[PDB]
């Protein structure tokens, strides 16, 4: 599936084996593992076919690491940038602090000298190329023109993203479960003179 | 001076309006804003005001302000994009290839001329690198900017009358995730 009993179980093993690995523990056997969860042996068997798991008993150090391993991809939030212009490209010299599993791992564009870069580490697309790339990432940054917005949105949602960063003018129609937040750097400037002008906030 | 008076007048009427007061006297107003009754009077002639209607003043300021500035420091890829995309008047930069030059109509110079180029201006954005932004913040300030734009990581320190609209990538995230992951 994964199943959803299974999934809920990864951050159990982990737990156990990270205090097996403080003890100084160096093997781990099914009936073990089957203790420290509640469960049985076959369940183990089949949780660790789901995982990816290798064994034989365990190796502590091994099922640690790779318990860790797959935590910490299930944990990282992945995020997808479209336009690498000026703001794009700042965005991709980002740099997020260690204790953040925050990253933006792939970009798009539709310029041909974009497309096949490499900006501040990461990959920029043909934006053609959306639909092979984008898998299980949850959050895009769009930072195109406001003309193109609206078609790109409406093809990011098809492929389940499930929040957009707006940085362009356009106001976005997309469907009651999509979380949007609206930065419009105009607008921010504009809110900003505005209050030391009239000592309230603009209107929208 | 007359249109340095008007937010002195403005400020304190759109307090007393708050009250339900419509009618202001000269000397109310200059033992509130510590201008002299007889400078109030003259002022108030000039606005066209015939004791004080309140909200005659008050709609009359907003529309001055409304009637009738920005710099920009850090000409990199996000001030770039700010300039490209309420006008910036003036750019400030330390890259010498930059300084005396025309980005997006607005020309830039050397940073070090900060303090002899700002005049007039209250509103500075701010896209530098982090560890460049509290210097600048303090030479901002005591230029005497009312409002800063600051689109760098920095936590910037100012004085509480300083407005600081902080826009950044991670903080916008962080937000945006913790949405994502507690409220599908
Ligand atoms: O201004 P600026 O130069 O910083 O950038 P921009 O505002 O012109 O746009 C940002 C980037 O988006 C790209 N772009 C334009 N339309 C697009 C689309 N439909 N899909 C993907 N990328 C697109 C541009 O090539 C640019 O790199
Ligand atoms: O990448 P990138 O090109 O955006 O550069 P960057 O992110 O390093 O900085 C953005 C812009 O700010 C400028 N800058 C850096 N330090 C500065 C300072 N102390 N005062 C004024 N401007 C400064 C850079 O020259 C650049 O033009």
């Not at 084996?17 to 068997?45: F, M």
């Not at 703001?87 to 933006?104: D, E, M, R």
């Not at 960063?165 to 900003?192: C, G, K, M, W, Y």
């Amino acid at each position: 599936k994964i199943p959803q009993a299974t999934a809920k179980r990864l951050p159990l093993y982990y737990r156990f084996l990270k205090n097996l690995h403080a003890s100084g523990k160096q093997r781990v056997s099914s009936a073990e593992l089957s203790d420290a969860v509640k469960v049985d042996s076959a369940t183990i068997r089949r949780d660790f076919s789901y995982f990816g798991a290798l064994g034989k008993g365990y190796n502590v150090d091994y099922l640690l690491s790779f318990f860790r391993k797959t935590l910490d991809q299930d944990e990282m939030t992945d995020v997808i940038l479209i336009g690498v212009g000026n703001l794009g490209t700042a965005f991709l010299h980002y740099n997020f602090t260690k204790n953040n599993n925050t990253k933006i791992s792939m970009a798009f564009d539709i310029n041909e000298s974009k497309i096949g870069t490499e900006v501040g580490g990461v990959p920029v697309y043909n934006l053609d190329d959306l639909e092979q790339h984008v898998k299980d990432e949850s959050v895009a940054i769009l930072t195109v023109p406001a003309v193109a917005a609206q078609s790109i949105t409406d093809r990011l949602v098809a492929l389940g993203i499930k929040g957009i960063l707006n940085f362009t003018p356009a106001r976005l129609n997309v469907p009651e479960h999509i979380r949007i937040h609206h930065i419009d750097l105009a607008v921010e400037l504009q809110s900003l003179v505005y209050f030391l002008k009239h000592y309230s906030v603009l209107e929208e």
